[PDB]
Design a protein around this ligand. Structure first.
Ligand code: HEC
Ligand code: HEC
Ligand code: HEC
Ligand code: HEC
Ligand SMILES: [Zn+2]
Ligand SMILES: [Zn+2]
Ligand SMILES: [Zn+2]
Ligand SMILES: [Zn+2]
Ligand SMILES: [Zn+2]
Lengths: 106, 106, 106, 106
């Protein structure tokens, strides 16, 4: 899917997690986030469209998604163990990484 | 391609790195490894065919590739800077990740 | 030093990195941050003062410094190669680890 | 404790883990390993006695303990949750990191 769609999927499911009531909702939303983040990993954002794929900017862009995926996986673990409140708190730590990338490449 | 072909790629290019003389040959091998691991991401290993694609086991399986890809990209940095022996030490630690996943899922 | 001093050292030197324009300044600040984080390793934060020093919580507390120390080292590596902007890009994500520990434990 | 003593602690407690019957023995052993590795983190090994603490060798030596501690932390987490066989298996994957460091610096 394209980057815009990946971002709407991330945004939608992050807000679901914030408001969910059960592990199943949280796990389902985190699974969708993991897939959208892993898909966006290969994207070229408009700010960097003329940069080399080997460029430091793009390496930093891809690193941001690697970080985000690792955080999503950790939240998924917490949810698979039924620590819904801990998984929801982790989702709030996700936002910082979202914002870190946006503050640079949006 | 499929997981088996992805793994042949990882194995072949790990051997290239070990015997390499120059940084470009290590960079080339690591780049192919990175591509193979990203393609293996979507795969269902035989030992997990009895699980749902969103099961804890399948997310842990993909987390192994997340680790591997992080390490591959660290070693690619070293190679891009001319540090052949340093990249070769990193590949020794890469094998620990190969083995750890194989211990659980191969 | 104690945790209160270590956090001032982390915060002061993070601000130095944010305003730096040369690699020597960034390298100096990151080295001080690494020392402070290593020193903070042994600390017990007030909200875990009732927990055993090997509860899941205290190992998880130390793991937060383990993440930070890894990120500091990565940024230090970049500074040692003269890549100010790349080092400063890494300090921004560093901030999310500060925040994440504070969210759980401050 | 000195580096040799740290290494005896690591080796003894790795064997305890392989021989354990319950999660509490595995947890106690990993706790001892986490502490000994964190002590060893700041040591200078005989092989690197004449090297700059800022040398690539010493950076790589310290990084090896950073890797090992992260692995120990992950195994301790598994044991704490009653994934006893997985914790024992992870401790068995520590050896690859031990050996990778020994190859270079012992
Ligand atoms: C880089 C590594 C990013 C991370 C991590 C996250 N996002 Fe993102 N996002 C990024 C870019 C480059 C852009 C701009 C896309 C463009 O075409 O200009 C965006 C955009 C968004 C948007 C707006 C999309 C739109 O249709 O206008 C949203 C809502 C968004 N991003 C959300 C979001 C969330 C919730 C994230 C973490 C969970 C997140 N982003 C991470 C780059 C990066
Ligand atoms: C999990 C995340 C894995 C990682 C990381 C690596 N491998 Fe792997 N490998 C994995 C599976 C599940 C399988 C079985 C595939 C099947 O259909 O049977 C394999 C298989 C291989 C092979 C095939 C030959 C064999 O002895 O089985 C090779 C040559 C191989 N793997 C190599 C390899 C290397 C070098 C890796 C790291 C660089 C590596 N694998 C990582 C799962 C995972
Ligand atoms: C570097 C990053 C290392 C890691 C990780 C591990 N060890 Fe180690 N080990 C290292 C050095 C430099 C030395 C030599 C110390 C000396 O001064 O001679 C060692 C030594 C050992 C020994 C022998 C100790 C002795 O008294 O001679 C053992 C039994 C040993 N190391 C075990 C061990 C284990 C089990 C590890 C991982 C769990 C491990 N070491 C990690 C450097 C490093
Ligand atoms: C846990 C692993 C932490 C990490 C990582 C960081 N900090 Fe922290 N910080 C932590 C705690 C438990 C506390 C509260 C301690 C207390 O006695 O109440 C703090 C506090 C701070 C403060 C406030 C200092 C004060 O005068 O009260 C600052 C300014 C601060 N922390 C900064 C900071 C920075 C910049 C970090 C990353 C670079 C960082 N902290 C990481 C625990 C943890
Ligand atoms: Zn790179
Ligand atoms: Zn768990
Ligand atoms: Zn470098
Ligand atoms: Zn000591
Ligand atoms: Zn270094």
């Amino acid at each position: 899917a394209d980057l815009e769609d990946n971002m709407e999927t991330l945004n939608d499911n992050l807000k679901v997690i914030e408001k969910a009531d059960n592990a199943a909702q949280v796990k389902d939303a985190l699974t969708k986030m993991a897939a959208a983040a892993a898909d966006a990993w290969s994207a070229t954002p408009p700010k960097l469209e003329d940069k080399s794929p080997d460029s430091p900017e793009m390496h930093d862009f891809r690193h941001g998604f690697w970080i985000l995926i690792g955080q999503i996986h950790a939240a998924l673990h917490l949810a698979n163990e039924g620590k819904v409140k801990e998984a929801q708190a982790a989702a709030e730590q996700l936002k910082c990484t979202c914002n870190a990338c946006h503050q640079k490449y949006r």
